[PDB]
Design an enzyme around this catalytic site. Structure first.
Site, mmCIF file in Angstrom:
data_model
loop_
_atom_site.group_PDB
_atom_site.id
_atom_site.type_symbol
_atom_site.label_atom_id
_atom_site.label_comp_id
_atom_site.label_asym_id
_atom_site.label_seq_id
_atom_site.Cartn_x
_atom_site.Cartn_y
_atom_site.Cartn_z
ATOM 1 N N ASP A 167 -5.681 48.311 19.303
ATOM 2 C CA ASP A 167 -6.936 48.591 18.530
ATOM 3 C C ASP A 167 -8.189 48.469 19.415
ATOM 4 O O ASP A 167 -9.283 48.786 18.982
ATOM 5 C CB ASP A 167 -6.963 47.530 17.425
ATOM 6 N N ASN A 174 -9.688 38.929 13.622
ATOM 7 C CA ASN A 174 -10.191 40.164 14.301
ATOM 8 C C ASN A 174 -11.451 40.692 13.613
ATOM 9 O O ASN A 174 -11.673 40.467 12.438
ATOM 10 C CB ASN A 174 -9.053 41.184 14.193
ATOM 11 N N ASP A 230 -10.568 39.481 18.877
ATOM 12 C CA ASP A 230 -10.454 38.487 17.769
ATOM 13 C C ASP A 230 -11.225 37.211 18.120
ATOM 14 O O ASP A 230 -11.339 36.840 19.274
ATOM 15 C CB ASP A 230 -8.951 38.207 17.626
ATOM 16 N N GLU A 289 -0.282 30.014 17.375
ATOM 17 C CA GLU A 289 -0.911 31.296 17.819
ATOM 18 C C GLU A 289 -2.117 31.034 18.745
ATOM 19 O O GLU A 289 -2.523 31.900 19.497
ATOM 20 C CB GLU A 289 -1.334 32.010 16.524
ATOM 21 N N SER A 349 -9.934 46.112 19.995
ATOM 22 C CA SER A 349 -10.934 45.196 19.363
ATOM 23 C C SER A 349 -10.786 43.779 19.936
ATOM 24 O O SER A 349 -9.956 43.530 20.792
ATOM 25 C CB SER A 349 -10.605 45.209 17.864
ATOM 26 N N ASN A 371 -7.359 43.645 22.474
ATOM 27 C CA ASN A 371 -6.183 44.308 21.837
ATOM 28 C C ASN A 371 -5.902 45.646 22.529
ATOM 29 O O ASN A 371 -6.740 46.525 22.558
ATOM 30 C CB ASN A 371 -6.591 44.526 20.377
#
Length: 130
Positions: A49, A60, A53, A35, A51, A46
């Site tokens: 969202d 996140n 991470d 990842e 937001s 994102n």
């Protein structure tokens, strides 16, 4: 700071995640390096969202860490997002632990089943950093 595959296994074991809640070093190495790739600074925006991470395991700040802009930030780790922003994953790996502490574990991402699905990964931690 992206190192080799058997380099973070030494940092993970020294922290205490080895054999923690059933998630061995290879279980997190099979998904963390996939990842992000041993990159604690692997941060992305994102589109759903809005937001951001921060951490080697895409932690996140919406339900794991309180940054100051994520609405409803419950911050389960109760720590700032700067810990997962540095290669020193001492408290950073501790915040990501809460993600696998639930009844799901490290299978929260679909890549877990497509990567190794918890198969024979003892070779990645066989005398790597113990």
């Amino acid at each position: 700071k992206v190192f080799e595959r058997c380099e973070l296994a030494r940092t993970l074991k020294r922290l205490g995640m080895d054999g923690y809640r059933g998630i061995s070093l290879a279980n997190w190495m099979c998904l963390a390096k996939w990842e992000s790739g041993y990159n604690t600074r692997a941060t992305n925006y994102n589109a759903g969202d809005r937001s951001t991470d921060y951490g080697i395991f895409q932690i996140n700040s919406r339900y794991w860490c309180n940054d100051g802009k994520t609405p409803g930030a419950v911050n389960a780790c109760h720590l700032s997002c700067s810990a997962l922003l540095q290669d020193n994953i001492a408290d950073a790996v501790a915040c990501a632990k809460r993600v696998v502490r639930d009844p799901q574990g490290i299978r929260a991402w679909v890549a877990w089943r497509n990567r190794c699905q918890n198969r024979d990964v003892r070779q990645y931690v066989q005398g790597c950093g113990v």
